[PDB]
Structures are given as C-alpha cells and as structure tokens.
Write a protein that binds this ligand. Sequence first.
Ligand SMILES: Cc1n[nH]c(C)c1C(=O)O
Ligand SMILES: Cc1n[nH]c(C)c1C(=O)O
Length: 379
Amino acid sequence: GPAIGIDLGTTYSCVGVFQHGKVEIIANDQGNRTTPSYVAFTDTERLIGDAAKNQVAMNPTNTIFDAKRLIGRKFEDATVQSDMKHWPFRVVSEGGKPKVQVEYKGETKTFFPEEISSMVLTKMKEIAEAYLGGKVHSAVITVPAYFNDSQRQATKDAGTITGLNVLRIINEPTAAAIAYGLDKKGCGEKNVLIFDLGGGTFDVSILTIEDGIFEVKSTAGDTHLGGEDFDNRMVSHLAEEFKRKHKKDIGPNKRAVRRLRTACERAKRTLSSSTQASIEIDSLYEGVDFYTSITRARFEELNADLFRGTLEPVEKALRDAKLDKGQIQEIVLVGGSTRIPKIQKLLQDFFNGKELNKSINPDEAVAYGAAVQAAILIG
Ligand SMILES: Cc1n[nH]c(C)c1C(=O)O
Ligand SMILES: Cc1n[nH]c(C)c1C(=O)O
C-alpha cells in the first residue's frame, strides 16, 4: 500500500504502519509517537500538531482543538452548545452546521470541523511519508463506537479532503481488540471490555467477538473526564503549597498557573513508573523558584474520587450489556491515563484479580489495530 492506521483522537492522534508482519508506530518530526489534534492560525501561517500545541498559550482564540466534538453534528445540538462555553475559540453556524471562526493572515475565516480534522490527517499522512518514503494512498481511520453515521461520514470527508482512500471507518474499541489479536485468540464468543481513559475523554465499551465478527454490546463513560482532570488536582495542591511556603497566591496569574500545570503534567507521567517526581520551576512568581517533589501516594490521594469513579461506567456498561463482571474474557487498556498504577489496581481488583491486556502502549493501541486492519484490507 503502504498499510496505514490512524487514530484521529480528540486531543492527540497516532499513526502506525503494518510492515514485515508487524506494526511500527510512527514518531513525528519532534520524535513524538503521538501528535496533538491541534491546528493554529497565525498572521502568516497554519500550524498543525506539536507546532500548533506549543504556541496555544500565545494564541488561544485562533488555536483549534476538540474538532472531533463538533464533527458530524449540528450547531443546535445540546453537546455543541454546552461544549462551546468552555472553548477559547469562537464557534458559529453555517447552514445549521458548526464552524470554527478564527483570525488568519489578518482576516476572519471559518472552517468546518472536517476541514480542521483533514489538516490533522494531512499532518499524520506526512509523518507516515517521512518515515516510509514516497506517498501514502490509503488508511484505516478509527472513530468512537457511539459515533452515528453523520459523524462517521464527516470523519471520512476529512480523509477525502486530505486525499486519502479511506479503506474503512472502524470503532476505536474494535481497533484496540484487533491490536491484541483478540479476534484470532482461542477461536466461541469472547466478551471484551475496552477501558479507554485519555487526556479529556473516558470510554468504556463492551464488545463480543466471534468467528472474527465484532458487535458493540454497550457503551458508557464520561465525555469530559481525562488525564487533564488529574493534573488540575495536582495544580491546586501545589499552588496551595507555594502559597504556604512563599506567602504568594499564583491563582490570579495565568502564566504562573499554566507553568505549574506543565510541571504537573510531566510529574504525573513520572509517577506512573516512579514513586516520586521532582518539580523544578525557575522564577514561578516574583522571582521565587518553585523546586519541590510529590509522591505517588499523594497523587492518588488528590484523585481518590476520580480514579475510583471510573468503575461506575464499567458497572453501567455491564448492566446495559446484561453481563456479570465474571462474564468478561478480556479487558483492554487504552489511553495514556491507563498507565496510572492505581487505575490498573482498581480495575484489576473490580475484576477479581483478572490480568489486563496492557503490553501495547495504551495511547498507541488504537492506531496499532487500525494498521493491522489496513494490512488485511489491502491484502
Ligand atoms: C493541509 C490541509 N489538509 N486539509 C486541509 C483542508 C488543508 C488546508 O486547507 O490547509
Ligand atoms: C506517558 C504517561 N505516563 N503516565 C501517564 C498518566 C501518561 C500519559 O500519557 O498520560
């Protein structure tokens, strides 16, 4: 082909290739194995991916993210009207469809959600082409299992605009199950729970798999819960610590809070493999450094409700599928937040000690399965 898989994610995207019998997940030009689903418009240029996310603080009204929350919807939809209230960018209506409105080269422009997503897809396509050489022609692109046909078709339109032959739109939990070979493992029916906790969304899906055929039995979750919520908890804790030690409230100061959040995001990643993380911020406020450290136990304490709370969508997906938790044959971890040991422990204890499918980087599992599926389709 080449055989290409794209996870077009709400805040991050991932691209993989199936080559010499195996998947390789592809790092972008900054060496990052996942790429922000971000597009920024400036006085001179259109930035995509890491370049767009890196200047977001400097240009928030013209930096688009979350276009996946708009794609395939109507402007009048309850979710659109609700989501709009939390974005720093303007959303407007054209023929009843939402468009983002930005400043670009000193003029006002509007873009359909599939136009922003096509720009993200083009960046993923060029990432794959730098890695492979030559041109990428086709891709499997994934969507959430709860997406309707307008959302699916608008995702496909993004691919068409990019100039990709979209071989198939497949469900994200389905691609994760394919990554683990669960359609080929021990071939009756398998009940598979996919536990997908990303940066800003939480999706639980129950699939059945039989003779290589997938059926979505139930979906549950929280469309506004992710890793960013855990970082908010750490930011409040550490802002209070800075106040206690240095008698300075950084709360009213946008830059000090943003820099604290950057340190907290990085600390949280380290806490997935170490029991402590060090914060090293130079001149956080009024020339006062903030060098400190945080333990894993403290991180878990600050997030006790949020982590334990992820089991309620698990219980609801089971009740909707009319399954007892003992009837799940496979559990798959997806999304960067599933690396958190306390989340893995809670999920494993809920499932009476059952081992978790977790050996694939969870932020890459969806693109990994999409790349396998692409290989099958091109043959
Ligand atoms: C680049 C690119 N890919 N898709 C679109 C719509 C664009 C653009 O217009 O810049
Ligand atoms: C990487 C990483 N390690 N731990 C976490 C929570 C992540 C992530 O990507 O969110």
